[PDB]
Amino acid sequence: MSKIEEFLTAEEEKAIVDAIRDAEKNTSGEIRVHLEKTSEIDVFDRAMDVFHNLKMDNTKLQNGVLIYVAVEDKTFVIYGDKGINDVVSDDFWDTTRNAIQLQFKQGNFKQGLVDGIEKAGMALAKYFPWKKDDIDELPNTISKG
């Protein structure tokens, strides 16, 4: 909180990284977070550039998500690859948004991301139920600006 260099402690980062590690074991689709200060342009177009620059479309099913968070304005954007957008609806995405929004509105960025990852994993597991042969295409490591 008082230290602006590191938004979360190693205890807090470990506990959110582990929250992604269990979701990969529940659905064949990928959940990445990108944390940054502020932008010089629009956050939507920037998140689309950052997703494509980080090469996150490199999946077999086209089903990676990036969560771009701007810590200065306290805002969050969520952007999935085409294989999510083409298979789900805005009504499916409303649940993900409300889970994160309510916890960012309390001020607890960890809890809002962790619960949003959890609810997304359970929802995505309806469209992509886990398989014993399932494959781990992205890594759990948090992205930073």
Side-chain angles (χ1 to χ4, degrees):
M1 295 182 298
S2 180
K3 294 188 182 184
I4 62 178
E5 188 71 4
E6 290 293 339
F7 296 99
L8 294 176
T9 61
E11 189 197 331
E12 295 289 274
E13 294 181 323
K14 186 184 179 181
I16 184 170
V17 172
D18 282 341
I20 308 168
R21 285 179 167 136
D22 281 309
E24 300 165 338
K25 299 170 188 178
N26 298 341
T27 177
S28 73
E30 299 289 3
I31 307 182
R32 210 178 202 217
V33 172
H34 180 87
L35 194 64
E36 187 159 24
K37 294 182 180 180
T38 190
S39 299
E40 184 158 344
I41 64 166
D42 291 314
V43 179
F44 181 67
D45 278 6
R46 186 178 174 98
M48 186 182 58
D49 282 331
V50 171
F51 188 112
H52 285 229
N53 290 180
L54 294 172
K55 205 190 181 182
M56 288 177 54
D57 322 65
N58 72 353
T59 54
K60 287 175 192 82
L61 297 178
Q62 303 193 269
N63 65 349
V65 181
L66 191 59
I67 304 147
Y68 190 103
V69 175
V71 300
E72 295 300 343
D73 291 358
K74 207 179 175 185
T75 55
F76 67 93
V77 174
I78 314 171
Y79 181 74
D81 192 10
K82 186 165 179 173
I84 296 150
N85 302 327
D86 288 20
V87 85
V88 307
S89 57
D90 189 50
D91 182 285
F92 178 95
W93 276 68
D94 184 57
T95 64
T96 312
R97 285 168 165 161
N98 283 304
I100 296 159
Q101 189 201 82
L102 185 54
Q103 281 291 333
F104 271 70
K105 187 181 187 187
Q106 285 162 86
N108 203 152
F109 305 154
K110 182 192 181 191
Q111 287 181 348
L113 293 172
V114 168
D115 282 327
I117 293 156
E118 192 185 351
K119 286 167 174 171
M122 296 181 77
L124 293 163
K126 193 177 189 169
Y127 293 79
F128 300 86
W130 195 67
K131 296 171 187 169
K132 182 167 180 157
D133 313 307
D134 194 30
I135 36 59
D136 174 76
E137 303 216 290
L138 263 67
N140 291 270
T141 312
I142 318 178
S143 293
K144 294 177 176 181

mmCIF file of all heavy atoms in Angstrom, residues 36-37 69-77 100-101 103-109:
data_model
loop_
_atom_site.group_PDB
_atom_site.id
_atom_site.type_symbol
_atom_site.label_atom_id
_atom_site.label_comp_id
_atom_site.label_asym_id
_atom_site.label_seq_id
_atom_site.Cartn_x
_atom_site.Cartn_y
_atom_site.Cartn_z
ATOM 1 N N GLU A 36 -0.109 -2.598 -14.647
ATOM 2 C CA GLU A 36 0.639 -1.414 -15.071
ATOM 3 C C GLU A 36 0.092 -0.140 -14.410
ATOM 4 O O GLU A 36 -1.013 -0.096 -13.860
ATOM 5 C CB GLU A 36 0.666 -1.369 -16.613
ATOM 6 C CG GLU A 36 1.578 -0.265 -17.175
ATOM 7 C CD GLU A 36 2.031 -0.499 -18.614
ATOM 8 O OE1 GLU A 36 1.373 -1.218 -19.395
ATOM 9 O OE2 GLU A 36 3.081 0.076 -18.986
ATOM 10 N N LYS A 37 0.909 0.924 -14.427
ATOM 11 C CA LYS A 37 0.606 2.210 -13.802
ATOM 12 C C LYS A 37 -0.545 2.946 -14.522
ATOM 13 O O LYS A 37 -1.682 2.954 -14.043
ATOM 14 C CB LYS A 37 1.901 3.040 -13.686
ATOM 15 C CG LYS A 37 2.880 2.370 -12.703
ATOM 16 C CD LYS A 37 4.157 3.198 -12.532
ATOM 17 C CE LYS A 37 5.099 2.496 -11.553
ATOM 18 N NZ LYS A 37 6.353 3.267 -11.354
ATOM 19 N N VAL A 69 -4.811 -4.232 -15.965
ATOM 20 C CA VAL A 69 -5.205 -3.397 -14.812
ATOM 21 C C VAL A 69 -4.342 -2.129 -14.759
ATOM 22 O O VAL A 69 -3.114 -2.229 -14.794
ATOM 23 C CB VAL A 69 -5.082 -4.194 -13.494
ATOM 24 C CG1 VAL A 69 -5.370 -3.345 -12.246
ATOM 25 C CG2 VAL A 69 -6.016 -5.411 -13.486
ATOM 26 N N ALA A 70 -4.990 -0.966 -14.638
ATOM 27 C CA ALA A 70 -4.339 0.343 -14.496
ATOM 28 C C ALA A 70 -4.482 0.826 -13.040
ATOM 29 O O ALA A 70 -5.529 1.306 -12.615
ATOM 30 C CB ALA A 70 -4.975 1.324 -15.488
ATOM 31 N N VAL A 71 -3.404 0.706 -12.268
ATOM 32 C CA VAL A 71 -3.438 0.927 -10.798
ATOM 33 C C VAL A 71 -3.625 2.397 -10.378
ATOM 34 O O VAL A 71 -4.046 2.659 -9.246
ATOM 35 C CB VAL A 71 -2.186 0.371 -10.111
ATOM 36 C CG1 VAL A 71 -2.069 -1.136 -10.350
ATOM 37 C CG2 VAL A 71 -0.926 1.125 -10.599
ATOM 38 N N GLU A 72 -3.289 3.354 -11.264
ATOM 39 C CA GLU A 72 -3.407 4.783 -10.975
ATOM 40 C C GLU A 72 -4.862 5.246 -11.000
ATOM 41 O O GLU A 72 -5.353 5.853 -10.052
ATOM 42 C CB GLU A 72 -2.585 5.606 -12.007
ATOM 43 C CG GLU A 72 -1.078 5.353 -11.935
ATOM 44 C CD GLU A 72 -0.449 5.693 -10.589
ATOM 45 O OE1 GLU A 72 -1.054 6.413 -9.767
ATOM 46 O OE2 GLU A 72 0.673 5.211 -10.325
ATOM 47 N N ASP A 73 -5.589 4.888 -12.067
ATOM 48 C CA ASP A 73 -7.008 5.183 -12.237
ATOM 49 C C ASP A 73 -7.895 4.176 -11.478
ATOM 50 O O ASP A 73 -9.087 4.437 -11.290
ATOM 51 C CB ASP A 73 -7.360 5.177 -13.733
ATOM 52 C CG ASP A 73 -6.775 6.331 -14.554
ATOM 53 O OD1 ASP A 73 -6.088 7.225 -13.997
ATOM 54 O OD2 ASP A 73 -7.064 6.358 -15.774
ATOM 55 N N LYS A 74 -7.323 3.042 -11.055
ATOM 56 C CA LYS A 74 -7.957 1.941 -10.305
ATOM 57 C C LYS A 74 -8.869 1.064 -11.201
ATOM 58 O O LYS A 74 -9.762 0.373 -10.690
ATOM 59 C CB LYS A 74 -8.646 2.500 -9.042
ATOM 60 C CG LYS A 74 -8.757 1.492 -7.891
ATOM 61 C CD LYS A 74 -9.433 2.147 -6.684
ATOM 62 C CE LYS A 74 -9.670 1.138 -5.545
ATOM 63 N NZ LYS A 74 -10.435 1.756 -4.431
ATOM 64 N N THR A 75 -8.682 1.108 -12.527
ATOM 65 C CA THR A 75 -9.540 0.475 -13.534
ATOM 66 C C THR A 75 -8.973 -0.871 -13.999
ATOM 67 O O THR A 75 -7.800 -1.185 -13.805
ATOM 68 C CB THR A 75 -9.769 1.416 -14.725
ATOM 69 O OG1 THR A 75 -8.528 1.812 -15.240
ATOM 70 C CG2 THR A 75 -10.536 2.670 -14.310
ATOM 71 N N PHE A 76 -9.845 -1.666 -14.621
ATOM 72 C CA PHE A 76 -9.535 -2.993 -15.142
ATOM 73 C C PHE A 76 -10.227 -3.191 -16.495
ATOM 74 O O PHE A 76 -11.389 -2.806 -16.688
ATOM 75 C CB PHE A 76 -9.982 -4.064 -14.115
ATOM 76 C CG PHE A 76 -11.491 -4.141 -13.920
ATOM 77 C CD1 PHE A 76 -12.252 -5.036 -14.678
ATOM 78 C CD2 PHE A 76 -12.127 -3.257 -13.019
ATOM 79 C CE1 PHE A 76 -13.659 -5.031 -14.591
ATOM 80 C CE2 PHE A 76 -13.534 -3.251 -12.932
ATOM 81 C CZ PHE A 76 -14.301 -4.121 -13.734
ATOM 82 N N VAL A 77 -9.520 -3.812 -17.440
ATOM 83 C CA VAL A 77 -10.041 -4.265 -18.733
ATOM 84 C C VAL A 77 -9.743 -5.757 -18.859
ATOM 85 O O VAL A 77 -8.778 -6.259 -18.299
ATOM 86 C CB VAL A 77 -9.453 -3.428 -19.902
ATOM 87 C CG1 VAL A 77 -9.849 -3.956 -21.282
ATOM 88 C CG2 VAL A 77 -9.957 -1.972 -19.795
ATOM 89 N N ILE A 100 -14.854 -9.033 -10.235
ATOM 90 C CA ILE A 100 -13.668 -8.162 -10.184
ATOM 91 C C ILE A 100 -14.043 -6.757 -9.733
ATOM 92 O O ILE A 100 -13.453 -6.255 -8.775
ATOM 93 C CB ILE A 100 -12.973 -8.167 -11.567
ATOM 94 C CG1 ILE A 100 -12.451 -9.580 -11.908
ATOM 95 C CG2 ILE A 100 -11.803 -7.164 -11.630
ATOM 96 C CD1 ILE A 100 -12.235 -9.791 -13.404
ATOM 97 N N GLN A 101 -15.059 -6.151 -10.358
ATOM 98 C CA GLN A 101 -15.526 -4.789 -10.065
ATOM 99 C C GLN A 101 -15.844 -4.616 -8.584
ATOM 100 O O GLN A 101 -15.375 -3.657 -7.981
ATOM 101 C CB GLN A 101 -16.789 -4.492 -10.908
ATOM 102 C CG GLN A 101 -17.240 -3.021 -10.858
ATOM 103 C CD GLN A 101 -18.714 -2.855 -11.241
ATOM 104 O OE1 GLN A 101 -19.599 -3.042 -10.419
ATOM 105 N NE2 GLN A 101 -19.055 -2.499 -12.453
ATOM 106 N N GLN A 103 -14.767 -6.163 -5.910
ATOM 107 C CA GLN A 103 -13.589 -6.274 -5.058
ATOM 108 C C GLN A 103 -12.598 -5.122 -5.288
ATOM 109 O O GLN A 103 -12.070 -4.578 -4.317
ATOM 110 C CB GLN A 103 -12.944 -7.633 -5.347
ATOM 111 C CG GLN A 103 -13.679 -8.795 -4.642
ATOM 112 C CD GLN A 103 -13.505 -8.770 -3.120
ATOM 113 O OE1 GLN A 103 -12.532 -8.265 -2.599
ATOM 114 N NE2 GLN A 103 -14.432 -9.291 -2.358
ATOM 115 N N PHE A 104 -12.416 -4.675 -6.535
ATOM 116 C CA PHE A 104 -11.693 -3.428 -6.828
ATOM 117 C C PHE A 104 -12.375 -2.218 -6.176
ATOM 118 O O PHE A 104 -11.695 -1.349 -5.637
ATOM 119 C CB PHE A 104 -11.560 -3.262 -8.350
ATOM 120 C CG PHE A 104 -10.312 -3.903 -8.923
ATOM 121 C CD1 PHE A 104 -10.188 -5.309 -8.961
ATOM 122 C CD2 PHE A 104 -9.252 -3.099 -9.362
ATOM 123 C CE1 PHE A 104 -9.017 -5.893 -9.451
ATOM 124 C CE2 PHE A 104 -8.067 -3.690 -9.834
ATOM 125 C CZ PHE A 104 -7.948 -5.090 -9.891
ATOM 126 N N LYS A 105 -13.708 -2.202 -6.140
ATOM 127 C CA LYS A 105 -14.516 -1.200 -5.449
ATOM 128 C C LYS A 105 -14.358 -1.239 -3.914
ATOM 129 O O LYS A 105 -14.480 -0.207 -3.274
ATOM 130 C CB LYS A 105 -15.975 -1.428 -5.875
ATOM 131 C CG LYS A 105 -16.962 -0.361 -5.389
ATOM 132 C CD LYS A 105 -18.367 -0.750 -5.887
ATOM 133 C CE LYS A 105 -19.377 0.351 -5.577
ATOM 134 N NZ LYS A 105 -20.744 -0.094 -5.907
ATOM 135 N N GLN A 106 -14.023 -2.402 -3.323
ATOM 136 C CA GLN A 106 -13.613 -2.511 -1.916
ATOM 137 C C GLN A 106 -12.154 -2.051 -1.744
ATOM 138 O O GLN A 106 -11.811 -1.428 -0.728
ATOM 139 C CB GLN A 106 -13.830 -3.962 -1.433
ATOM 140 C CG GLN A 106 -15.321 -4.257 -1.195
ATOM 141 C CD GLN A 106 -15.656 -5.755 -1.132
ATOM 142 O OE1 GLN A 106 -15.574 -6.408 -0.101
ATOM 143 N NE2 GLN A 106 -16.092 -6.349 -2.219
ATOM 144 N N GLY A 107 -11.294 -2.263 -2.743
ATOM 145 C CA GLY A 107 -9.878 -1.861 -2.785
ATOM 146 C C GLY A 107 -8.896 -3.023 -2.749
ATOM 147 O O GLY A 107 -7.684 -2.804 -2.741
ATOM 148 N N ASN A 108 -9.382 -4.268 -2.750
ATOM 149 C CA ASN A 108 -8.563 -5.465 -2.623
ATOM 150 C C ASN A 108 -8.304 -6.111 -4.002
ATOM 151 O O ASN A 108 -8.989 -7.057 -4.415
ATOM 152 C CB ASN A 108 -9.211 -6.416 -1.608
ATOM 153 C CG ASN A 108 -8.231 -7.409 -0.975
ATOM 154 O OD1 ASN A 108 -8.439 -7.845 0.143
ATOM 155 N ND2 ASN A 108 -7.113 -7.768 -1.585
ATOM 156 N N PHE A 109 -7.286 -5.612 -4.712
ATOM 157 C CA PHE A 109 -6.951 -6.045 -6.077
ATOM 158 C C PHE A 109 -6.689 -7.549 -6.170
ATOM 159 O O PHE A 109 -7.190 -8.201 -7.083
ATOM 160 C CB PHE A 109 -5.739 -5.245 -6.575
ATOM 161 C CG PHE A 109 -5.847 -3.723 -6.545
ATOM 162 C CD1 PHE A 109 -4.674 -2.951 -6.438
ATOM 163 C CD2 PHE A 109 -7.094 -3.070 -6.648
ATOM 164 C CE1 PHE A 109 -4.744 -1.545 -6.441
ATOM 165 C CE2 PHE A 109 -7.163 -1.666 -6.642
ATOM 166 C CZ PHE A 109 -5.982 -0.904 -6.540
#
